[PDB]
Design a protein around this ligand. Structure first.
Ligand SMILES: Nc1nc(Nc2ccc(S(N)(=O)=O)cc2)nn1C(=O)c1c(F)cccc1F
Length: 290
């Protein structure tokens, strides 16, 4: 039993709202005291409850339970529903959903200052994750959640891997390709540096405000050619990335931010900056402003 089986009993986990999809997440209220209501929580469940999917779910639960950081979604427990013959993950509920939907829905309260604040908080969450030798493998604005105007948190650790003891990279043997590093596309090798590449893509997303056709997939398809389909796309992408093909500077994006993006988008793995470098640089850019 990963979590205390009495902490969240299914008879008191009341449904409130469906939140969407790597599995499926609901909004619930844990109401132990008759109808006193209580804590609002997010509940993740599986969509195709197979043995392999449930083992991956166990791995994700173990990853999330070991994390305690201001920019990481809080683990709260596990609910063993269906007479303790099923497994559901309990975490905190962030009211404003994904950072992508937040940038699309609430543009009235978002500016460059907020974008740099979110960038820094993501960097610090990733530093914390690297201290655990975890590789998130899926850094994207859709997987970063907004608690309020001033706080974002890294979530969706379904693809997260633990680095081997004597290896600085993890080789996956079983895909958001437009967020992948070239070595991830060509060798299935994932590391902190590939997470830094995906973070560069995340910064691009932030400074595009995710407008029409400005997304990394649409931009990469426009550069590759919308006439192509299938593995050929991937092929072109790899070739495109091998010879310095990059996403363009978003409109209104400062040249220093795009320089950070391009430094993250280095084909040389060891030349990409660390998350500590990136957090320090972003915070100094914020602090040096008037
Ligand atoms: N823990 C958590 N809280 C939320 N808040 C949320 C999400 C969506 C909306 S909505 N229907 O677009 O307006 C509103 C509030 N999500 N969340 C998750 O783990 C989560 C995730 F990581 C990815 C996808 C879905 C999730 F649910």
């Amino acid at each position: 039993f990963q979590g205390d089986p009495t902490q969240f009993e299914e008879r008191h986990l009341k449904f409130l709202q469906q939140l969407g999809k790597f599995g499926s997440v609901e909004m619930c209220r844990y109401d132990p005291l008759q109808d006193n209501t209580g804590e609002v929580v997010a509940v993740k469940k599986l969509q195709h409850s197979t043995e392999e999917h449930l083992r991956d779910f166990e791995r994700e639960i173990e990853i999330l339970k070991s994390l305690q950081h201001d920019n990481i979604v809080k683990y709260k427990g596990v609910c063993y529903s269906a007479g303790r013959r099923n497994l559901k993950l309990i975490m905190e509920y962030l009211p404003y959903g994904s950072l992508r939907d937040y940038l699309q829905k609430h543009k009235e309260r978002i500016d460059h200052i907020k974008l740099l604040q979110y960038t820094s908080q993501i960097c610090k969450g990733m530093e914390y994750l690297g201290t655990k030798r975890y590789i998130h493998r899926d850094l994207a604005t859709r997987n970063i959640l907004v608690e309020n105007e001033n706080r974002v948190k890294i979530g969706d650790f379904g693809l997260t891997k633990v680095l081997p003891q004597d290896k600085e990279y993890y080789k996956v043997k079983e895909s958001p390709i437009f967020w992948y590093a070239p070595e991830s596309l060509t060798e299935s090798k994932f590391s902190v540096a590939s997470d830094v590449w995906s973070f560069g893509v995340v910064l691009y997303e932030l400074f595009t405000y995710i407008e029409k056709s400005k997304s990394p997939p649409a931009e990469f398809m426009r550069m590759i050619g919308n006439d192509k389909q299938g593995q050929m796309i991937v092929f072109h992408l790899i070739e495109l990335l091998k010879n310095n093909g990059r996403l363009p500077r978003p409109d209104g994006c400062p040249d220093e931010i795009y320089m950070i993006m391009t430094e993250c988008w280095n084909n040389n793995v060891n030349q990409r900056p660390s998350f500590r470098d990136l957090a320090l640089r972003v915070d100094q850019i914020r602090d040096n402003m008037a």
